Amino acid sequence: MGPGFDFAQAIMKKNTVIARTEKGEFTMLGVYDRVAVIPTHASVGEIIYINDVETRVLDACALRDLTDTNLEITIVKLDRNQKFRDIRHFLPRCEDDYNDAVLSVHTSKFPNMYIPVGQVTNYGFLNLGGTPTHRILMYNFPTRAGQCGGVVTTTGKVIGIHVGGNGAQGFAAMLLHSYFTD
């Protein structure tokens, strides 16, 4: 409908796949080469389905900060025959608050879904499903089961992936440029 939805759509059309694990279907953001991200609660194993194709997992790393606190991001390298467009230059370098964000989801259940979530707070600590979690972003939208792995963007920035909600608020794990240096 406007420039926020335009940037979100451009990311969804080239940099997402549908990932299936034993714990469900997730929106999965591809970042560069064969490297993608997914919430750690997806429990990635040795094999994953990517757009309903059986795919070997070459590496999976559940990120934690240097306090050894959960970040809820898993970085996955896929045994896929095709690279993602490199979008690392759209990742923030530092922890920050944002205005006018969009949460975008693409699954069997929720295809071509875009949600204007508004203002995003650098919330920090969250007890997420019983697990102490850092670098959480918060937005005042009643997000639901099926939106985990959804991409959070502003115009020109890919800032996080949706990891949970409390019925009134939604929560994303930050994406930082430093996670994807090579």
mmCIF file of C-alpha atoms in Angstrom:
data_model
loop_
_atom_site.group_PDB
_atom_site.id
_atom_site.type_symbol
_atom_site.label_atom_id
_atom_site.label_comp_id
_atom_site.label_asym_id
_atom_site.label_seq_id
_atom_site.Cartn_x
_atom_site.Cartn_y
_atom_site.Cartn_z
ATOM 1 C CA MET A 1 0.000 0.000 0.000
ATOM 2 C CA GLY A 2 3.032 2.344 0.605
ATOM 3 C CA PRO A 3 6.901 2.366 0.755
ATOM 4 C CA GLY A 4 7.095 0.162 3.921
ATOM 5 C CA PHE A 5 5.015 -2.583 2.282
ATOM 6 C CA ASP A 6 7.126 -2.090 -0.911
ATOM 7 C CA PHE A 7 10.418 -2.873 0.929
ATOM 8 C CA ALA A 8 8.769 -5.801 2.836
ATOM 9 C CA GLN A 9 7.417 -7.300 -0.453
ATOM 10 C CA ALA A 10 10.853 -6.989 -2.146
ATOM 11 C CA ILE A 11 12.411 -9.032 0.728
ATOM 12 C CA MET A 12 9.606 -11.650 0.739
ATOM 13 C CA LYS A 13 9.665 -12.224 -3.054
ATOM 14 C CA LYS A 14 13.436 -13.021 -3.246
ATOM 15 C CA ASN A 15 14.788 -13.791 0.288
ATOM 16 C CA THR A 16 12.227 -16.196 1.906
ATOM 17 C CA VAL A 17 11.504 -19.923 1.726
ATOM 18 C CA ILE A 18 8.984 -22.081 3.587
ATOM 19 C CA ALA A 19 10.921 -24.213 6.119
ATOM 20 C CA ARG A 20 9.302 -27.315 7.679
ATOM 21 C CA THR A 21 10.717 -29.098 10.763
ATOM 22 C CA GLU A 22 9.055 -31.635 13.118
ATOM 23 C CA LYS A 23 7.865 -28.562 15.143
ATOM 24 C CA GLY A 24 5.964 -26.942 12.186
ATOM 25 C CA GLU A 25 6.097 -24.679 9.079
ATOM 26 C CA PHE A 26 8.071 -21.402 9.473
ATOM 27 C CA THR A 27 8.836 -18.342 7.368
ATOM 28 C CA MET A 28 12.636 -18.578 6.846
ATOM 29 C CA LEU A 29 14.759 -15.574 5.811
ATOM 30 C CA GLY A 30 17.688 -16.256 3.451
ATOM 31 C CA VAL A 31 20.544 -13.775 4.114
ATOM 32 C CA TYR A 32 23.382 -14.622 1.633
ATOM 33 C CA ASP A 33 24.873 -17.659 -0.206
ATOM 34 C CA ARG A 34 23.052 -20.752 1.291
ATOM 35 C CA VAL A 35 22.775 -19.165 4.823
ATOM 36 C CA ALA A 36 19.310 -18.562 6.343
ATOM 37 C CA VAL A 37 17.782 -17.906 9.812
ATOM 38 C CA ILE A 38 14.871 -19.440 11.746
ATOM 39 C CA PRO A 39 13.705 -19.257 15.396
ATOM 40 C CA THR A 40 15.681 -21.680 17.611
ATOM 41 C CA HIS A 41 12.371 -23.246 18.861
ATOM 42 C CA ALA A 42 11.973 -24.693 15.274
ATOM 43 C CA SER A 43 14.516 -27.366 16.514
ATOM 44 C CA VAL A 44 16.427 -27.720 13.186
ATOM 45 C CA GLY A 45 17.973 -31.206 12.716
ATOM 46 C CA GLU A 46 20.177 -32.898 10.100
ATOM 47 C CA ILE A 47 17.317 -32.706 7.471
ATOM 48 C CA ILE A 48 14.763 -29.888 6.840
ATOM 49 C CA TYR A 49 12.069 -29.355 4.123
ATOM 50 C CA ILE A 50 12.603 -26.139 2.044
ATOM 51 C CA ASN A 51 9.534 -25.372 -0.172
ATOM 52 C CA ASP A 52 8.592 -29.122 0.355
ATOM 53 C CA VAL A 53 12.061 -30.357 -0.932
ATOM 54 C CA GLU A 54 14.095 -32.662 1.401
ATOM 55 C CA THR A 55 17.318 -30.676 2.139
ATOM 56 C CA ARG A 56 20.437 -31.625 4.111
ATOM 57 C CA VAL A 57 21.472 -29.163 6.834
ATOM 58 C CA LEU A 58 25.244 -28.483 6.384
ATOM 59 C CA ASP A 59 25.485 -26.498 9.684
ATOM 60 C CA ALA A 60 23.077 -25.120 12.342
ATOM 61 C CA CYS A 61 24.160 -22.764 15.161
ATOM 62 C CA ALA A 62 21.778 -21.623 17.923
ATOM 63 C CA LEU A 63 23.149 -18.151 18.803
ATOM 64 C CA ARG A 64 23.754 -16.988 22.407
ATOM 65 C CA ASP A 65 25.222 -13.639 23.576
ATOM 66 C CA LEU A 66 28.526 -13.378 25.473
ATOM 67 C CA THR A 67 26.471 -13.548 28.761
ATOM 68 C CA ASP A 68 25.654 -17.147 27.435
ATOM 69 C CA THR A 69 21.978 -16.011 27.188
ATOM 70 C CA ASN A 70 19.629 -17.407 24.454
ATOM 71 C CA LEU A 71 19.113 -15.039 21.415
ATOM 72 C CA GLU A 72 16.434 -17.352 19.803
ATOM 73 C CA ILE A 73 18.152 -17.120 16.351
ATOM 74 C CA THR A 74 19.464 -20.262 14.640
ATOM 75 C CA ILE A 75 21.727 -19.739 11.586
ATOM 76 C CA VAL A 76 21.324 -22.588 9.096
ATOM 77 C CA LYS A 77 23.514 -23.442 6.101
ATOM 78 C CA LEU A 78 21.387 -25.390 3.554
ATOM 79 C CA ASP A 79 22.613 -28.000 0.986
ATOM 80 C CA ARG A 80 20.640 -26.079 -1.695
ATOM 81 C CA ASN A 81 21.626 -25.747 -5.405
ATOM 82 C CA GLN A 82 20.968 -21.975 -5.487
ATOM 83 C CA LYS A 83 22.182 -18.892 -3.536
ATOM 84 C CA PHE A 84 20.037 -16.163 -1.897
ATOM 85 C CA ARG A 85 20.424 -12.553 -3.000
ATOM 86 C CA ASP A 86 22.935 -11.008 -0.539
ATOM 87 C CA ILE A 87 20.860 -8.712 1.796
ATOM 88 C CA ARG A 88 23.525 -8.254 4.549
ATOM 89 C CA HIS A 89 23.784 -4.503 3.711
ATOM 90 C CA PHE A 90 20.112 -4.115 4.937
ATOM 91 C CA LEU A 91 21.001 -5.440 8.460
ATOM 92 C CA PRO A 92 21.479 -2.980 11.356
ATOM 93 C CA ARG A 93 24.901 -2.748 12.973
ATOM 94 C CA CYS A 94 23.588 -1.912 16.510
ATOM 95 C CA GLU A 95 20.659 -2.537 18.912
ATOM 96 C CA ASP A 96 17.997 0.162 18.257
ATOM 97 C CA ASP A 97 14.314 1.221 18.409
ATOM 98 C CA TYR A 98 12.401 1.780 15.108
ATOM 99 C CA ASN A 99 9.280 3.509 13.770
ATOM 100 C CA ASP A 100 6.691 2.133 11.315
ATOM 101 C CA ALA A 101 7.714 -1.550 10.961
ATOM 102 C CA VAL A 102 6.016 -4.332 8.884
ATOM 103 C CA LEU A 103 5.883 -8.012 9.881
ATOM 104 C CA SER A 104 5.690 -10.243 6.736
ATOM 105 C CA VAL A 105 4.814 -14.008 6.744
ATOM 106 C CA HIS A 106 4.679 -16.596 3.951
ATOM 107 C CA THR A 107 3.485 -20.149 4.828
ATOM 108 C CA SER A 108 0.871 -22.690 3.503
ATOM 109 C CA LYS A 109 -1.541 -21.271 6.210
ATOM 110 C CA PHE A 110 -0.643 -17.533 5.781
ATOM 111 C CA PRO A 111 0.542 -16.765 2.185
ATOM 112 C CA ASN A 112 1.420 -13.173 1.191
ATOM 113 C CA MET A 113 0.633 -11.830 4.717
ATOM 114 C CA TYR A 114 1.824 -8.278 5.675
ATOM 115 C CA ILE A 115 1.049 -6.581 9.061
ATOM 116 C CA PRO A 116 1.803 -2.925 9.870
ATOM 117 C CA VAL A 117 2.925 -3.316 13.544
ATOM 118 C CA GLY A 118 3.946 0.358 14.095
ATOM 119 C CA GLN A 119 6.564 1.402 16.655
ATOM 120 C CA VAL A 120 9.244 -1.160 17.663
ATOM 121 C CA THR A 121 10.856 -0.918 21.173
ATOM 122 C CA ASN A 122 14.327 -2.244 22.076
ATOM 123 C CA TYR A 123 12.740 -4.317 24.891
ATOM 124 C CA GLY A 124 15.910 -6.304 25.764
ATOM 125 C CA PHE A 125 15.266 -9.095 28.285
ATOM 126 C CA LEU A 126 12.255 -11.432 27.869
ATOM 127 C CA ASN A 127 11.343 -14.693 29.598
ATOM 128 C CA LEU A 128 10.296 -16.360 26.325
ATOM 129 C CA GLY A 129 8.418 -19.634 26.988
ATOM 130 C CA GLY A 130 10.425 -20.029 30.251
ATOM 131 C CA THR A 131 13.835 -19.265 28.553
ATOM 132 C CA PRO A 132 15.725 -16.023 29.492
ATOM 133 C CA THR A 133 16.252 -14.305 26.094
ATOM 134 C CA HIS A 134 18.151 -11.093 25.153
ATOM 135 C CA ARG A 135 17.989 -8.570 22.216
ATOM 136 C CA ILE A 136 14.151 -8.738 21.958
ATOM 137 C CA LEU A 137 12.212 -6.168 19.918
ATOM 138 C CA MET A 138 8.553 -5.546 20.917
ATOM 139 C CA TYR A 139 5.536 -4.278 18.928
ATOM 140 C CA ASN A 140 1.934 -3.731 20.025
ATOM 141 C CA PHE A 141 0.201 -6.194 17.696
ATOM 142 C CA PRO A 142 -1.728 -9.380 18.703
ATOM 143 C CA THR A 143 0.404 -11.854 16.718
ATOM 144 C CA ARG A 144 -0.672 -15.563 16.567
ATOM 145 C CA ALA A 145 0.669 -19.105 16.051
ATOM 146 C CA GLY A 146 1.861 -19.372 12.421
ATOM 147 C CA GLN A 147 3.764 -16.000 12.387
ATOM 148 C CA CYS A 148 7.069 -17.251 13.941
ATOM 149 C CA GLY A 149 10.021 -16.669 11.562
ATOM 150 C CA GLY A 150 8.079 -13.713 10.073
ATOM 151 C CA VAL A 151 10.403 -10.952 8.856
ATOM 152 C CA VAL A 152 10.360 -7.524 10.589
ATOM 153 C CA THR A 153 11.417 -4.644 8.266
ATOM 154 C CA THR A 154 11.396 -0.871 8.059
ATOM 155 C CA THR A 155 12.081 0.983 4.753
ATOM 156 C CA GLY A 156 15.677 -0.021 3.887
ATOM 157 C CA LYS A 157 16.242 -2.300 6.979
ATOM 158 C CA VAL A 158 15.680 -5.988 7.883
ATOM 159 C CA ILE A 159 15.703 -5.713 11.706
ATOM 160 C CA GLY A 160 14.422 -9.041 13.193
ATOM 161 C CA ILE A 161 12.449 -12.313 12.969
ATOM 162 C CA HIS A 162 9.176 -12.900 14.954
ATOM 163 C CA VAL A 163 9.707 -15.407 17.845
ATOM 164 C CA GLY A 164 6.583 -15.063 20.083
ATOM 165 C CA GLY A 165 3.758 -13.049 21.636
ATOM 166 C CA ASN A 166 1.635 -12.673 24.799
ATOM 167 C CA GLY A 167 -1.772 -12.149 23.042
ATOM 168 C CA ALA A 168 -1.427 -8.264 23.064
ATOM 169 C CA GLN A 169 2.299 -7.786 22.126
ATOM 170 C CA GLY A 170 4.602 -9.506 19.603
ATOM 171 C CA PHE A 171 8.334 -10.141 20.068
ATOM 172 C CA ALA A 172 11.171 -10.435 17.497
ATOM 173 C CA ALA A 173 14.841 -11.454 17.874
ATOM 174 C CA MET A 174 17.219 -8.781 16.511
ATOM 175 C CA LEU A 175 19.191 -9.416 13.356
ATOM 176 C CA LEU A 176 22.615 -7.757 13.501
ATOM 177 C CA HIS A 177 25.168 -7.442 10.648
ATOM 178 C CA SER A 178 27.848 -9.029 12.952
ATOM 179 C CA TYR A 179 25.948 -12.381 12.987
ATOM 180 C CA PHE A 180 26.757 -12.953 9.219
ATOM 181 C CA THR A 181 30.425 -11.893 8.685
ATOM 182 C CA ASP A 182 32.509 -14.439 6.632
#
